[PDB]
Design a protein around this nucleic acid. Sequence first.
RNA 1: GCUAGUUGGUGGGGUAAUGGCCCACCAAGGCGACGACGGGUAGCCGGUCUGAGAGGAUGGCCGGCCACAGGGGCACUGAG
RNA 2: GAGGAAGAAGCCCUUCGGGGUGUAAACUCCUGAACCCGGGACGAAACCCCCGACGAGGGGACUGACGGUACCGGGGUAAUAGCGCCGGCCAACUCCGUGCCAGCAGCCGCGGUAAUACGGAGGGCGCGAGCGUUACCCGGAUUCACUGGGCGUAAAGGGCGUGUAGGCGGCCUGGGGCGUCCCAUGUGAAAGACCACGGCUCAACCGUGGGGGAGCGUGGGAUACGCUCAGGCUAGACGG
RNA 3: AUGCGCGCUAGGUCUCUGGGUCUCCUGGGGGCCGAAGCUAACGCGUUAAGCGCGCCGCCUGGGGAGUACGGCCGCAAGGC
Lengths: 122, 137, 208, 82, 99, 148
Amino acid sequence: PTINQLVRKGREKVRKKSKVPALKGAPFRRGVCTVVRTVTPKKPNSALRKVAKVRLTSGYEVTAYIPGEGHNLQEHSVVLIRGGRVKDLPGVRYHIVRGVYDAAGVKDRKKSRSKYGTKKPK
Amino acid sequence: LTDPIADMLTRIRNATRVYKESTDVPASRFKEEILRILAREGFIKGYERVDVDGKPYLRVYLKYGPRRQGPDPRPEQVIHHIRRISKPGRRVYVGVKEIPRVRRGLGIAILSTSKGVLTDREARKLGVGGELICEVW
Amino acid sequence: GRYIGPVCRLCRREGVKLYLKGERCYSPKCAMERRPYPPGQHGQKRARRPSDYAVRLREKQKLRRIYGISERQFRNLFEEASKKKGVTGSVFLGLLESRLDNVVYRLGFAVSRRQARQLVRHGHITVNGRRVDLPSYRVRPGDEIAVAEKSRNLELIRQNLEAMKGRKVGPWLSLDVEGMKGKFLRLPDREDLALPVNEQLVIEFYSR
Amino acid sequence: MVKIRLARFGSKHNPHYRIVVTDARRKRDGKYIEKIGYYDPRKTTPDWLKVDVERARYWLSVGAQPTDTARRLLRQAGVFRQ
Amino acid sequence: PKKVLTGVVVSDKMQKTVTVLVERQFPHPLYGKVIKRSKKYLAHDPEEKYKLGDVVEIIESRPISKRKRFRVLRLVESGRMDLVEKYLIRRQNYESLSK
Amino acid sequence: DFEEKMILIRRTARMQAGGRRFRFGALVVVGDRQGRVGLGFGKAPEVPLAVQKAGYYARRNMVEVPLQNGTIPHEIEVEFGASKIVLKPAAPGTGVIAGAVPRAILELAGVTDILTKELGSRNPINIAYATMEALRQLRTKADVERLR
RNA sequence: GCUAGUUGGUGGGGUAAUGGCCCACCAAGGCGACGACGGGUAGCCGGUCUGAGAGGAUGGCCGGCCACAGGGGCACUGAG
RNA sequence: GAGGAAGAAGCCCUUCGGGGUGUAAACUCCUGAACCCGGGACGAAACCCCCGACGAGGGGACUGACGGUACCGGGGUAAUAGCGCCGGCCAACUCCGUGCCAGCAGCCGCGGUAAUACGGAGGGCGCGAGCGUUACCCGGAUUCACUGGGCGUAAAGGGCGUGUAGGCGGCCUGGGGCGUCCCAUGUGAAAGACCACGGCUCAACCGUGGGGGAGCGUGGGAUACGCUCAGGCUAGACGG
RNA sequence: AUGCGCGCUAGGUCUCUGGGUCUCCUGGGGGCCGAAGCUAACGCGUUAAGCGCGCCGCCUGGGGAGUACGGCCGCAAGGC
Ligand code: SF4
C-alpha cells in the first residue's frame, strides 16, 4: 500500500479468537459431569471415545474428553477441566483432568504418571 | 512526473543493465552534484553537461567490469544496486547517529545536508545529518 | 543438584574418554577402554547419522557434563558470557574455568572435579584466606587458594600433592605443593584449554 | 516541612540509606527531592558514609529539617564544623 | 514560554472571538511521512478587528471562556481566504457523508 | 580433498502404466572450509548413486568465497525465485546462525560467524541455490576498490 | 451527525484564582470523516515480557499520578 | 568422593553365543548434610546528660523483635530423587500385552495380529527438587510486510470517467528559514535496563559511581532537500 | 481476469492512421515473435507482468457467505 494509504488506514492488527471459550479465561475451570457417555470419533479413526458433557462454574455446559483407561465418572461428578480439543472428536474442546475431585487416577498406570493423576507405587 | 532523482537513478539502473556506454538525463544543479559524487566515488566513468533540443542533459558515462569468462560474458555491473531512499511519498531524514553503514562500507549512502550533498562517510566525518537520498553499491 | 549417578557411561554415551574419576580415568579399567560405545541395550548397534541438533546437543551435553554444572547454571553463565564482549566462546570458557572447584581440580588438588566439589562443599579450602565453600564460586585472577590448615593434615590432599610432586599445571595457574596453595594467575585461554569440544557448536545450541 | 532523612534501600537485613532532602509528608521511600548522600549503617564498606556537605548546607540554609538520625550523620559528616 | 501559534482566521461569527485554523506538520510516528494536521482555536479578539482570512499569531493565555484560551498575538497576513475556502470546502463536504 | 554433506535426499515419483516408479534426488554440498564450496544436486535411481553422483556435480560446481576472519565482507540478500535469503556478517564470537540447509553450506565454506535468515519460500533446494548464488556475489573491499 | 449553558459576548455570583464554574440577558453560534457524538473496552505512567530490531503485548510487586472508601448526593471545619 | 568385574546378583534382550543394566552395585578407604556442644554478633548511635556557651566541638551513659539468629570453634553420621519423553518435528529403542478395541495425540497421524506412535517391562534421552499440562502474551508469523508482503491465473484492480478533499509534484534564481540537520542547553525523577567497581563466604540481592537515553522546552548556526514567498524558463500541461 | 499518470530499458515483423526530404525516416494507435529483465510456472516483454516514482482501490486460509443483521437506494426484482 502507498504510505498515504497506511496513513489513511494503516495495517489492521488481527486478534485471535480464544480456542477455549469455556475456561474464560482461567487455566482450569471446575464443572459437574452431566452426561458421561461415549462417542465414536469421525473418520478415519474408529473407536468409542469416552466423552462427558459437563456444565462449568462459568455457566457453560460443554463436552470434555476423559483421558486414560476407564473411569469412575458419572452424572453429577465434580470435575476440573482444561486443555485443547481432541482433533479426531467433533468439537470436544476440553479435557477432564484425571486426579481432580472425581477423576481418580488411572489405576495400574506406570508411565506418564504425573498425567492421569496416579500416585507413585510403594 | 513525480521525482526526477529516482528517474535519473533508474535511468542509470536501466542503462546499467543493458550495458549502455552512457545515458542522458534532464540536467539539474541537484542531480549534477549526485553525478559528481558517483564519479568522485568511482561509480561511473564520469558525466558531462550536454544539450539535446535546447534542453540541457547529462551524458552519464557508465563504468563496467571486465568481460567475464564462462556462459555469461557480460562484465560485472559496477553499480550492483541503486535505490532512492527518501522518496516523494515518504521523505527520510537522518541524524548523525543513524546514517547507516551501507553494505559494511562497500556500498555508500549519498544524503543531502545543509552542508550540501554528501556521502555517509563524509557526513560522519563532518558529524551532520540530512535527508537521505539513496544507497548504492 | 549435581549429577550423582554412574559417570563412566557419560563417556560411553559421549563416546569420548572424558576424565571423571582420576585413576579409573587412566586405568585400563576405564570404561572408554573396555566398552568404548554408548550404554544401554542398543549400545553396540550401528550408530545412525546424527542430526545437527543431536550433534550440537551432544556438544553441550559433552561440555556441560565435563563440569557437572546444572543446565541452568550452565545456561546462566552463557548469557553472562554472552552479554560480555569478545569471543563469547573463550569468554564462556574462562568463566567455566573460573569456577572454584574447577580451579581446584585444575590446580590438581582433586583427582576429579566431582571430588573437588566435596573439598569446596565441605569447606576444606580457603580463597585468599576466606574459607569458601561455594562450589560455583568464581576465582578471579591473581587470587590465592590453598588447603585449609586443618585440611592440610588430611592425607587425600597429600595424595593429590603426592601426584603433583612432579606434575604440572596450566599456564594461567601457579601451584605450591608444600605450601598446599595455588594462585589463579589469569583467565584460561581457549588455546590453553584441552577441552575436547567445539564450543562453537555449543554456542549455536543456544542460538536456536 | 521539607526535611532531610534516610530512606531505606538495599534489602532484608542489608540496610542502605540515602541521606536525602525531601518533603516531609512523602512516604519514606517515595519520590525524594535530592539524594545528598548514602549511608551504610552496617559499615561494611570503607566509605560507608559519603554526604555532600554543601547541599545539606544549602538545604539547611533554605529551611531543611534533618531528623536526629540524619543530623547525627551530617555533623558526623562535619557539615556543621564551622 | 507562552505557546505561540500562527493560523488563519476561519470564523469570526462570535463576538470578540475569531476562529484560527492552526495547521501543523509532523512526521508520522510509525510510517515516517510528514503529515499535516490542522486545528481550530478560538482566540480572543477583544477588539474584533482581525477579520476572516487573516494569518495571525495566537498565544497561550489565561482562560477567557470555556473554549477560549488564546489571544491574537498579532496579525501576520491578510487576504488568505483561499486557505479559508479549503476549510469551508472541508466542512462543506461533511453534508455529502451522511446517510 | 573436500568435505561433503548430504543436505537433502528426497524421492520423487513419476506415475505411468503399472504405477509409480521412484527416483532419488540429493542435495550434496562439498567444500574445504576455506572459501571453496560446491552445491551438488544429483538425482538417480538410488541413494548411493545419486549421492555419489550429487557430490560429483558439487566438485565441478565449486565456488570459492571471500572469507574474512571467519565471516563474509558484507551482508547480502538473494531472491532465488521465491526463496529470499538474507545473510549477514557477525563478530568472531557470534557463530553460524542459519537454517540447517545454508548452515550446512556455510559450515563448509569455512564460515564460522554468520547471521542469516530465510524468507519467502524455504524450499531446501531453492534455499541452497540462493545461498550458493549469494556466495557467488560476495566481494572483498579490495575487489570493489579494483572496480573503482 | 453532535451540540441550545450548547459557542461566544456583556454584567453579575462563586473561587486562593481564570473559566459557562454558576446566573441574567444579547447574538447563533461551536463540535465532526484530521472521525464528532454513540457503544465496547481500560486505571495512566517509569517500566515488564517478548523481539535481531522495528515492533507487539503488558502495567502483578516496586516508584509517581488519578479515582474510589457499602452505592449516591451534600457540604462544615480546616492551609489543605 | 576415590578405588572397586572383562562385569556379582536380579532383571531385560537374545542369533543362545552372549549383550545391557554397570564401577552401577556390594565391597574398602576419605570426607563430613545433618545433627551435639559451646561462643555468638553488625545492624546502635543517636535522642538524652555534662562541658563548652543552649553554637562549633568534646566527654558520659542508655536502648535489638529479629535472635542466642546468622555466624565461629569443636565433635559429628554416607545421609532424599523425581518428572517428562523416546515415529518425525526432536534426543532417546527393543521385548511383551492389545489387535481400528483398548487407547494416544500439538500436527503429521498411530491402533484392523508381530504397534520403535496404545499399556507394561528393560534400555535410553532431557531436566533436576523439580519435572509436565493447561491458561495467556510475544516470537517463529516477512502470516498487517514502516524496517519488511502483495493483487493476469493462487485472495486481492474498483465497471468506467469526472472530479472534491487530500496526497504528490518540472527548471533556474533569490528571500524566509517552517520542516530538516547540527551545536549548546534544561529536562528527560527514583528505581529498573547497560557499564565499572563493591558488600553480602559466590549468586540471586543490594550499594556506589559512570553512562546514557527517544521526546519536549530554550538559544545559536546551515540552507542541500522538501515548505513559503518573489522573479524568470520552456522540456510537462493547455491553447492557436 | 492486468487502475491511472509519467520516465527509461534490444530488436524483428504485420497492420491501421498522419508528416516528411518517400530506399527511408518521423508520429499516433492495433497484433505477432522475442533482448535484458521479470515471473512459481504458465508467460509478460516499448501496448511490460521489467526497472522507478506519485496517487487511488483492494487481500490476509476454505466454507460458512456476498449470506445474516443493520443502514442506504430501489416500484419490484433486488443492489451497495
Ligand atoms: S575415563 Fe574412565 S573414569 Fe573418567 S569417565 Fe571415562 S570411564 Fe569413567
